[PDB]
Design a protein around this ligand. Sequence first.
Ligand code: COH
Length: 103
Amino acid sequence: GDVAKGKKTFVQKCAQCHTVENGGKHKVGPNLWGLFGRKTGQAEGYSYTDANKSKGIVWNNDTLMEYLENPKKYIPGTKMIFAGIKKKGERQDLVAYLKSATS
Ligand code: COH
């Protein structure tokens, strides 16, 4: 995807609740450094719902694309209150940015 477009999407729709840099702070939601290839609910020092800790899947392109379309459908009980990025292209560019900015 397009990293520069995904970045703007992240700043507009995600930054209020998340940081991406290494050592970044937890805001409403968890810092996302190291997200890819890791199981759900594993950011150090963040208090996740039991649902986000137990989903049990590994975050990658496939699972993040599904999740970001409708967070609560994928993780029922989640405290991330956000409707989702409905357009596939916008979601793909956002995943491209996340992959680039979290490692
Ligand atoms: C109003 C707050 C808010 C918004 C707008 C938002 C917008 C977005 C966003 C924008 C499209 C992106 C890319 C993300 C991405 C994520 N968020 Co949020 N998140 C938010 C609050 C949270 C919270 C809170 C959690 C933890 C949920 C839980 O523990 O159930 C979270 C969890 C997540 C996770 C799972 C982390 C993990 O399993 O370690 C990802 C990925 N996210 N979030």
